[PDB]
Amino acid sequence: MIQPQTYLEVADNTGARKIMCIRVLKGSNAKYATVGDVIVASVKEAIPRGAVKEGDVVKAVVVRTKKEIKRPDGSAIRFDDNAAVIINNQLEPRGTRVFGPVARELREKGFMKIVSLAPEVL
Amino acid sequence: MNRGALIKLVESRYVRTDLPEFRPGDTVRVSYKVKEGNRTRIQDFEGIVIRIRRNGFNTTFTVRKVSYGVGVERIFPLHSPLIQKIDIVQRGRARRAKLYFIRNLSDREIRRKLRADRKRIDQDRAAERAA
Amino acid sequence: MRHLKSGRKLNRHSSHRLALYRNQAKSLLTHGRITTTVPKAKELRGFVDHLIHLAKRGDLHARRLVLRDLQDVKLVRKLFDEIAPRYRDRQGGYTRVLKLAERRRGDGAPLALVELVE
Amino acid sequence: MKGILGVKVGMTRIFRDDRAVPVTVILAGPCPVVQRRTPEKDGYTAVQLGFLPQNPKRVNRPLKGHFAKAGVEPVRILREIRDFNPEGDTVTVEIFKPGERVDVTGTSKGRGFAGVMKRWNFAGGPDSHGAHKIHRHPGSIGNRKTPGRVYKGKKMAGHYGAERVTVMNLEVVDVIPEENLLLVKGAVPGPNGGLVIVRETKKA
Amino acid sequence: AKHPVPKKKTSKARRDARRSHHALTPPTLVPCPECKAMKPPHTVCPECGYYAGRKVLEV
Amino acid sequence: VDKPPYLPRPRPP
RNA sequence: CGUGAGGGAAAGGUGAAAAGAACCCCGGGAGGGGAGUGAAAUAGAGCCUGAAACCGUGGGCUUACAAGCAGUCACGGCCCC
RNA sequence: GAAUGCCGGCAUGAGUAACGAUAAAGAGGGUGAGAAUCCCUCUCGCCGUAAGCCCAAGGGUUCCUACGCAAUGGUCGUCAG
RNA sequence: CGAUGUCGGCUCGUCGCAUCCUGGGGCUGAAGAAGGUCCCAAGGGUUGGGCUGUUCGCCCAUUAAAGCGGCACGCGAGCUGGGUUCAGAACGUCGUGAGACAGUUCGGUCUCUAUCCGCCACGGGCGCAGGAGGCUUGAGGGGGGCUCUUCCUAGUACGAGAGGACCGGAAGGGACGCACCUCUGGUUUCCCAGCUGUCCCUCCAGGGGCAUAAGCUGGGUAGCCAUGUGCGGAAGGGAUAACCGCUGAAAGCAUCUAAGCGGGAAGCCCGCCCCAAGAUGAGGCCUCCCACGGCAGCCGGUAAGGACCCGGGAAGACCACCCGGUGGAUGGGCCGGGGGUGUAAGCGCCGCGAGGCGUUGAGCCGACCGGUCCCAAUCGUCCGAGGUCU
């Protein structure tokens, strides 16, 4: 459950370590982003000579949340952090690897490249 | 009129009786029916059960696993039809009903805190010897 | 709201309310019959019935349980040896409440008697 | 239009097509028609239904008469369904098949004297920064000399709940005729044990 | 607050009109089947001490 | 818009 | 009242005569009801006269679809002489 | 008939706010016309570098006992500075 | 001027329309898509941030859009008190000076009690010419009214190309609304356990008080809840706006109009939901009692019924509403189940001991779902028609 001011871990090798959400791209006035939703964020922490650098305003999709997400089969899943993957305007990952599990919900939302790259899909 | 009975009656067609008993602290492997398009397959989720919240047909249990460097928790309905089976992989000895506290512990610390439940382990091997 | 909530508050915090019940229990078990306000009376029944029912058990466990509220060994001896036996075949309802006709002068409080049953 | 009286028994979820579906169980049948309203006699069309059977020791003489004229055992609740005229002398759950959408009416839970925040979702006041005893207050309630008064209907604190509420277009998930049971998907107004009315939906 | 205050003296009519709901309801009483004395129902009779047929209390 | 006050802030009696 | 210098009130009347109500009754008392005193006791000491605001009990007329500085003019109903 | 006049009396607001630290009460037995409130007993709670004890200021019989409850006591009162 | 509190914010709205969006149009230097400009339209909607006391404005990220005004520049007996009108102090500047400055700077007492109208809720009374118990009609009111993306049609019409539809159809959302507690997630003042210090019972063991109005800590049922769940905006009928017509004179042509008839909006009327016969215009249906005794009135006891009283209640401030009162499951006990806690005490064994193991998912155990007359709703009382006249 992500909103502006929320810090996200970035789960790729774009060079970003930590991004802070500044807007959730979902209608006129959405309050929260969950898995599969796209946010606009600021790169608050990066590592030297990456693609992205601190201060960059980037787009990203949420792949993990500490707030458990509920599923039609009556089950839920919850992660230890809130994590995102930095993308381009074509919803494609800018990196070449994604680290850690991702929510299966990404699949139904057309983020196949990230799902494929993900080491595990839960 | 017995309102409680009516509900139990509605629920009865959906009740399961084929799953093994397990406690918070046990290490369990839940084989879950997962859909990915357009075929469905069985995905295994294995971790410590940190919570069981009982409510008859509506009890649910929560299993916790560390997956590729990230902690993952999964809530399952105890009578969900998407559970193929559940395999007790290990009996764990807890001293409380909810084990949320293990979220802040190292792998070493969890291990010392959840000693193997030797009594129920023996009980497991004591059965499984059948006619 | 108060939907499906059980238990009066009797304008006392948690520990005072407990003491109130415990003290009334000691007095009831001691004199067999006391006079209180109607609300206090109606609330005392359950608290004392449980204590009596445990005396009906008889075992060490029950004695030590009852001792938590009654706190007095002699009074508990009376409970197990003289009170409990006459309720051997009774299924609950070891206490009764009957309302008096006159209110307190100083505050108009309606009164009631609480007594152990025959 | 068709309908039945019933008591709300409780909530659960059942599984259907690998989906968890929240349900409210309703004991609907059986409801004897005890009077029929006719355009010739009553000026409109509806059926007075009875529900739940009543200890005759409690049925007064005018009520006794009413039931007797219909050849009907004493019932606890009398209620009409508008523009509904069943062929039989008894309405049961079977008038609904699974898959139909229905409208359920009940008496909502009562919040008693409700504040303006609970009742009307007002924001109330700040909890620090100087806020002075107005944390759950409604703020201004008007203008000044013009108009010099307060509108009728001004949202204010007051009683809330214990009122007729109809939620609409609920899926009938299942019906169990041998137990006079209806399983409706989602939520139904009022407490368990409350009397509800199940009508065929007016949504298209 | 800014100290609200009555704007006009209340008339004798309006003051007495307010009190149109102030009259006491007489005590509800019934005869005690034993001593025929009048007492509130569902209370132990304070005159003979009887309730539900039996002597319960010393008067 | 900012205009000058026409009354002082009320002092105690 | 003010540390103080100093400031500074309110408060008169039974009856001619106490003859100031023995005694009895209800009441813990207060208070009252009889008895008694007196020309007179709503002159009974909370006492001459006892206005008004104000409070109350009883009776007559009137009032719960009506718009107001409360009255005034007309007519009708009810009550009284 | 008015001077936010002066003195006094009585109203309205009103059976309304409040009854002065949220340390806390319960029962049984006495007394008495009358008892939540006075006496006794048991249970419970609060203070304990005090909310205990001893001085000095200041106060001036408030001390002890008997007999009392009109007023003083923010209720009651048989109790009391 | 014997006082009409003054900027901005917050809260709560409501109105206007010179319309920001959404809907409907005409013209276009309108190919398509997208704009421009004007007309109709006030139903709903009109985001979150950085800076400043700011209104305003600039900026960031979005959006269908990020409208402009009135309501004492709406709203301080509603809150704030940053701005600004007191007393302190300082800077620049002016003045010999005391002091002063639409120049600046730091600080600086915002009043428990609502009489009347108005508003939100809830009752009492009387009325609706028999007196009653139910079930209803709906005059008239109120609520609601938003919108986007993607896919199909179709890479089709249009276009060199880039780009890319009308109409029709399908799915998925944001914000808001009503209800709900199965799930998710809260709380859960004593439901369970662990723990420290002290005092105590009774020495050990086992317990109790206090450490908060839970000592602390880990959990936690019912209830009440949102972050959780269901559902809503319509569909549809009708009459219209701008606008477009058919037929058609005056005026042999022409003309939407002068006779007449169509089409046409998120708007209007109905439809949906809720209130509602004090609708004194007091409605309707079903059923019950009934022709009482004494002189359109009075008195006396009744009938159908009702009230009082009591046990209670997801009903509730009181009142009301609703259920029940022994011909009874209403509450309280008790029992069974659920649920919570997570293996009581006691004993036995192991260890020098702290402890460990077994007995044992034990012991304890609020509210939830039921059962059971063990306790209590004993016994009763009082109101309550006799039906006005054409």
Ligand SMILES: [Mg+2]
């Ligand atoms: Mg990572």
Ligand SMILES: [Mg+2]
């Ligand atoms: Mg930098």
Ligand SMILES: [Mg+2]
């Ligand atoms: Mg950038």
Ligand SMILES: [Mg+2]
């Ligand atoms: Mg039941």
Ligand SMILES: [Mg+2]
């Ligand atoms: Mg249930």
Ligand SMILES: [Mg+2]
């Ligand atoms: Mg059954």
Ligand SMILES: [Mg+2]
């Ligand atoms: Mg089960």
Ligand SMILES: [Mg+2]
């Ligand atoms: Mg079950």
Ligand SMILES: [Mg+2]
């Ligand atoms: Mg190690």
Ligand SMILES: [Mg+2]
């Ligand atoms: Mg073993």
Ligand SMILES: [Mg+2]
């Ligand atoms: Mg509360």
Ligand SMILES: [Mg+2]
């Ligand atoms: Mg209850």
Ligand SMILES: [Mg+2]
């Ligand atoms: Mg309660």
Ligand SMILES: [Mg+2]
């Ligand atoms: Mg309690």
Ligand SMILES: [Mg+2]
């Ligand atoms: Mg009390």
Ligand SMILES: [Mg+2]
């Ligand atoms: Mg209180």
